[PDB]
Amino acid sequence: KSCCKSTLGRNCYNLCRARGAQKLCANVCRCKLTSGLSCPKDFPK
């Protein structure tokens, strides 16, 4: 699951995924990938 800090980072990640991998997109859009089924409180977007 990807978990972003802001709505900005969420749009960033989704657009990035058109051509990039999860892991690279998470980094550039300041998002976090988690193994859990829910996002932490601090990465709710």
Where along the sequence are the contacts to a copy of itself (CB under 8 A)? 17-22, 34-38, 40
- Minimal distance, residue 20 CB to a copy of itself, in Å: 6
Is residue 13 classed exposed, middle or buried when 0-12, 13-18 and 19+ CB atoms within 10 A define those classes?
Answer: buried
Nearer to a copy of itself, 20 or 30 (CB): 20
Nearer to a copy of itself, 7 or 18 (CB): 18
Nearer to a copy of itself, 7 or 38 (CB): 38
Task: Give the whole-angstrom CA distance, residue 36 versus residue 23.
Answer: 16
Task: Give the whole-angstrom CA distance, residue 29 versus residue 15.
Answer: 10
